[PDB]
Amino acid sequence: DNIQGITKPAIRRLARRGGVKRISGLIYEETRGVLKVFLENVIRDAVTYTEHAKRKTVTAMDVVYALKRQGRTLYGFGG
């Protein structure tokens, strides 16, 4: 599956940038669930803005407005 494309080594890299020294084996599946929940929440709102505009293309701005609503404001992609 695609969620499994988010690899153990890549999750490690993320942890490292997070200052993490040692990782438990259950961490990788736990991290995947968290990311999926995060993407579902943000993508759901962005697509809601896409449909409202009557488009078939999810725009950077759709994503930016979605992130802002979730209180996760992002700089660098417009607006």
Binding site: R17, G18, R22, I23, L35, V64, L74
Partner: protein, 98 residues
């Protein structure tokens, strides 16, 4: 032969990744994940390339801050190894997990 002790390379990697800014999840795989999830809300969607990047930058910044909080929870328990319970405690307190 030669062998670094457990933890030494781990430290090295933290220093390296805390010093750079490139994304750490391979792109193609991330893109498939995004499209797959979007498809459950609205079929036949297209994505501006910058839209997927915004999502990747947002996701990685999120996961990285979560890991720092997770690390703080593991250290609080006198450990240096993060566990599922550490991520859970951090999310509950953040208000994401009730």
């Amino acid at each position: 032969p030669h062998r670094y002790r457990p933890g030494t390379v781990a430290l090295r990697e933290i220093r390296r990744y805390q010093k750079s800014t490139e994304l750490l999840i391979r792109k193609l795989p991330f893109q498939r994940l995004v499209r797959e999830i979007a498809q459950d809300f609205k079929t036949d969607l297209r994505f501006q390339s910058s839209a997927v990047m915004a999502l990747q930058e947002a996701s990685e910044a999120y996961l990285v801050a979560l890991f720092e909080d997770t690390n703080l929870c593991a250290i609080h328990a006198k450990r240096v190894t993060i566990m599922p319970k550490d991520i859970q405690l951090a999310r509950r307190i953040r208000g994401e997990r009730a």
